[PDB]
Design a protein around this ligand. Structure first.
Ligand SMILES: Cc1cc2nc3c(=O)[nH]c(=O)nc-3n(C[C@H](O)[C@H](O)[C@H](O)COP(=O)(O)O)c2cc1C
Ligand SMILES: Cc1cc2nc3c(=O)[nH]c(=O)nc-3n(C[C@H](O)[C@H](O)[C@H](O)COP(=O)(O)O)c2cc1C
Ligand SMILES: Cc1cc2nc3c(=O)[nH]c(=O)nc-3n(C[C@H](O)[C@H](O)[C@H](O)COP(=O)(O)O)c2cc1C
Ligand SMILES: Cc1cc2nc3c(=O)[nH]c(=O)nc-3n(C[C@H](O)[C@H](O)[C@H](O)COP(=O)(O)O)c2cc1C
Ligand SMILES: CCCCCCCCCCCCSc1[nH]nnc1C(=O)O
Ligand SMILES: CCCCCCCCCCCCSc1[nH]nnc1C(=O)O
Ligand SMILES: CCCCCCCCCCCCSc1[nH]nnc1C(=O)O
Ligand SMILES: CCCCCCCCCCCCSc1[nH]nnc1C(=O)O
Lengths: 335, 335, 335, 335
């Protein structure tokens, strides 16, 4: 295969560090402040131990599932990551092409270096969603939703954990965004604006960035269709729990009323299994996709997605699960 | 800005290590004995995880609060640190000037390299308090209180955790204070002397150095106006808990009868948020102020205070808090 | 003695790393994926603390016990490890000869580089068992059992945790087995095939690879004679618990109906004591045997087994135990 | 003072490593096997946190206490360490002279490089006890007790955790004792031999090496006068708990019927405070005494003892304790 030989997600990061300008690599890697939550997003997955069932017959595995009523090849989807064209010339076009190939969904950043329309045209058969920021300018906010609707996108992920940008130390050091966001994004965002957004579109809406059970229930009350349990990849408020650690309480709080997803520190097939065992319908990957792009554009993303798929297929088979329906809560226990 | 580029409190320490004579840097940095509590003052903050509320509207933040009935710009104040003129020529004059600029309070060491009067004259509009040791000589002890009263200081912080000085290994190695304190400070100090001090002055009095809930309640009983939960920056008895870990029990013990403050290991805006979520009215910083002074005197202190302010403003906004009144206990949970 | 001087199991590994080609050493050492469980198999033993009884009279120790009704010199036996002829020319013949000398049992891999018959002929007086994989080809599966029966083997250990091979990163890097196993081993294996196997042979059957209490009880229900609590030396599903940590729950689940064994991270006499105190009849060693072989073939295996025996004899005597019958559960408590 | 400048117990060890032949340093330093308990004897003290009382009046401290009815200057005494003449020419004579100077007790090894009589003559006013092994030869065992009685020793510490010597890896590597002990010490030792010993002498008898509450109570039943909670400095059975962690359960089990002491990992004044807060009458130091000897014979031991005394005096004063009677259990809580 392609050289150098990369066989797990960490290899992709290690490769990306070797080829990317420091300030770009740093921008992608960084967490907020002392990066306590960034270390924890990963370490937390390790604390959840797996309890595999044997002798279940795993000759045939079917990794397919559904996200907000749309079928996907696997419970592993591409999360929004700004400015993908810094990692590769093809940026978000490469990403959507790979998602089309794999049969999974792509969440498009509002801060994409490719337009809603262009992404639809590169991947017309891909499952596509828009990640939306509520800008101070509600007119452009509305325009984005309408372009998403018109261009055949299938949900809006409204990010609710970024009234201001987090403080990522390397970005400041590298004189690299916090000021631009403060100029553009509306920090006044409340549940009122979520009601506005719910009236504006009939598309499925997911609140991205929920970490509390009470906010989750509030999301349900406002007719939202899903919760993405996210600490924004540990890039916003540092010292928040790992997403894997809060997921079960969010899942409990929501009472099956709404689909619950996770992102933050997914690197391996076992991370995927553990999230699903805890009640997540699907997970999203942020950084691994950028590492994929940095390695080989479309094929790199495809590689990263296929590593995650097959790692997940194996962990599923080793744990006695033929498909996602048979993943249950007795599969996991925290140490 | 000023070079080298320092953007968080740790940078200031790293700079101070590079420019200060070893024995001075060491004197400032050191904890007691094996520095177990010194590591814990910091590590403990990391264990307390934040549970941010989303969609609260944080377009306007007001960090102002009040300490012992006096208004301050932020719940972040300067704690007493002896011999500031070793870090910078302007020492405590630079410090009070910065506190005046920021609108926060300065706690003046009894072991200041500037007099009560001089500090009042450098920062006549600054909120100023005296940190008092009860010397064997009660006449000078009384003189200090009377000078503080006459010079427009607004409280006495009586330090109660230093009957003798702790054993800081580097100070001994560097042949650098323990003997001088044993000659000067009265180890016979009991609750009787606190009753004396309470009769001596009508100024607000805070017991600094309380780590036990029973002592806290005893402080309330003696008509004291506040508790500063402090292990003296881990420089007295090593192996005492981190201040953040004992705060909630002190807060509980006191039953809202008296204001409770914290110092010890505050380095970040999130440390400030976490202390307030646990019931502290305000925090004090010791070392970061000395690092500030070592970098650029007044402006350095101002920089350190402004880093803490804005870090705190951000952590507040990211956690859904517009002001300090809405900080509550559901914001935190220990891991 | 023989040089270099090796006096504990870790020395043997350190020696084997120095003399074996990297890809062979790596093949032997590796765990699955990030090797979380591989670190835990060992670290977990360290968390279980010993509570030795004094003054019991340990002048005479008898380490003998019985496995599936057959007497052994010690509760320490050789687990199946594929392709031993990579470590030494004599491979499995050297291993069985050493087991014969020591009076303990050898578990023979289905993937041995020596035949069932040859191993019987090298060690005709050795206690010998067959580790069986259920191949897609049930005819060869049956042939192996029949050769084991005919050649005087005394049990079948059916491995139930390998429907597919785990992903061992170094093997992939070194272009070293996963594909060959997927071609050969039947992933469709269920409890039905265990019923088949139970009808096929009157030999004692042990399910190897059980990690769950419910599977353990299911094993009992199917007339199996033992459980080998195993995570396949952390080489299958990564993130499963250490075997020492799940043993007590398996032991409880089984209600003394069946003998329970452990493998995974046994390196020391105290590991052996701790497993027995938790309810294991006997332990199996995988890697230490390969390290032994790499050092000096038969004598190396003999050395490793004798280190384990005597380490175990000492830990037994120091803990007040004259024989295995007096090992009890009050001997251990987890920290 | 004397050079190099050593100001805490760790400095003494660091000095001893620099001047002692490796095999001698190693012999002294080593724990058993992987030295898990050796690390834990120390780390465990760190987990017990101190809760100092303020404002108690600590102008006068009295560190004096009593051990088995005999007064000592401090609750810090010298434990038995074999072959002290390897660290210094004066060996046990230097040690007893220092104990005489300080007014504390010396526990003399049965494996001393100085005789019972000679030690009595070097330190005729020192508080002296004999550490006794029950040799296979009961005639010499009895002779030692009778010489101790005749020479004015005031207790027998019978070591009950060494039926065989532990396996200390460096000793084996360095070809350095296990065989000699197996030839000399009786592994058949039971409670019967303790009854024998109790009939043999009217001297106070302490069982040294108890780690279990049931053995402790058995010790009480046999008319023993004290328990020394000891894991033999982590040199016997590895993986036993730290002595500080089991002390409170031993203390509880004994119901104040008998005095309870601790050794194992005492390096600091706070270690002493923490042991007493948990119920120990006194602690014993092993290794620090050998480090003292290696530095400067008698004066070195004196220095180490005085460091421990004054460290303890300070920790006592900082925690609000004027004497040992006022040390209580609310002073400590495990983290
Ligand atoms: C380089 C980068 C850029 C990101 N840009 C966005 C964005 O534009 N919009 C958004 O909602 N989240 C953004 N996020 C957060 C991700 O959507 C997601 O929550 C996070 O990457 C998932 O964690 P993981 O990277 O550890 O997979 C970004 C994250 C990274 C790492
Ligand atoms: C260099 C230094 C000097 C100090 N001098 C005093 C003092 O004179 N009086 C006093 O009450 N506390 C003194 N303290 C303790 C501080 O008031 C405070 O409790 C501690 O610095 C806060 O912890 P932090 O440094 O980790 O912020 C000193 C602390 C340091 C680090
Ligand atoms: C190099 C190696 C080869 C192995 N081959 C087999 C095998 O052929 N069949 C099997 O059931 N288990 C196999 N195992 C797993 C072992 O039977 C056993 O569960 C594991 O080695 C015990 O753990 P330890 O190595 O840490 O002792 C193998 C393990 C290793 C390390
Ligand atoms: C070098 C050395 C020699 C020892 N020799 C004896 C001995 O002869 N008899 C005995 O009962 N204990 C012996 N011990 C154990 C000590 O009495 C004691 O339990 C241990 O040293 C205390 O732990 P610490 O060294 O960490 O202080 C020895 C310990 C060491 C470190
Ligand atoms: C091709 C024209 C450029 C399109 C506009 C892109 C501007 C993006 C600058 C603002 C920085 C966003 S960084 C961000 N937003 N949300 N999450 C993140 C993150 O870095 O985690
Ligand atoms: C300008 C004339 C000098 C004024 C007197 C200063 C003497 C200070 C020497 C005593 C050392 C105090 S160090 C201290 N006190 N309290 N806390 C500390 C600390 O180092 O934490
Ligand atoms: C002498 C002729 C060769 C006999 C057939 C040996 C083929 C073995 C190749 C398959 C790789 C097995 S590796 C394995 N199986 N079970 N556990 C393991 C392991 O590596 O843990
Ligand atoms: C001057 C003549 C020599 C007197 C006899 C000394 C012999 C000692 C050799 C046996 C080794 C004892 S080491 C030991 N015993 N108990 N605890 C220990 C230890 O090393 O912890």
């Amino acid at each position: 295969s392609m050289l150098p030989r990369l066989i797990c997600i960490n290899d992709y990061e290690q490769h990306a560090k070797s080829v990317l300008p420091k300030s770009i690599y740093d921008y992608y890697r960084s967490g907020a402040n002392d990066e306590e939550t960034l270390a924890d997003n990963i370490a937390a997955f390790s604390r959840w131990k797996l309890y595999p069932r044997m002798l279940r017959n795993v000759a045939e595995t079917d990794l397919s599932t559904s996200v907000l009523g749309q079928r996907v090849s696997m419970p592993i989807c591409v999360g929004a990551t700004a400015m993908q064209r810094m990692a590769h010339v093809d940026g978000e076009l490469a990403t959507v092409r790979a998602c089309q190939s794999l049969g999974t969904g792509m969440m498009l950043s509002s801060w994409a270096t490719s337009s809603i329309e262009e992404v639809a045209e590169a991947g017309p058969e891909a499952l596509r969603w828009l990640q939306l920021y509520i800008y101070k300018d509600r007119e452009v906010t509305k325009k984005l939703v309408r372009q998403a609707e018109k261009m055949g996108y299938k949900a809006i992920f409204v990010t609710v954990d970024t009234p201001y940008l987090g403080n990522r130390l390397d970005d400041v050091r590298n004189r690299f965004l916090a000021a631009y966001v403060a100029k553009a994004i509306d920090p006044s965002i409340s549940w009122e604006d979520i009601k506005w957004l719910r009236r504006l579109t009939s598309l499925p809406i997911v609140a991205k960035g929920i970490l509390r059970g009470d906010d989750a229930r509030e999301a349900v009350k406002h007719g939202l269709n899903g919760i993405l349990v996210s600490n924004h990849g540990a890039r916003q408020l540092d010292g928040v729990p790992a997403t894997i650690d809060v997921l079960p309480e969010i899942v409990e709080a929501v009472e099956g009323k709404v689909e619950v997803f996770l992102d933050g520190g997914v690197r391996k097939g076992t991370d995927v299994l553990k999230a699903l065992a805890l009640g997540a319908k699907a997970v999203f990957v942020g950084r691994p996709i950028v590492w994929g792009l940095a390695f080989q554009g479309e094929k790199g993303v495809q590689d990263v997605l296929e590593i995650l798929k097959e790692e997940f297929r194996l962990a599923m088979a080793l744990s006695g699960c033929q498909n996602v329906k048979v993943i249950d809560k007795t599969l996991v226990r925290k140490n």
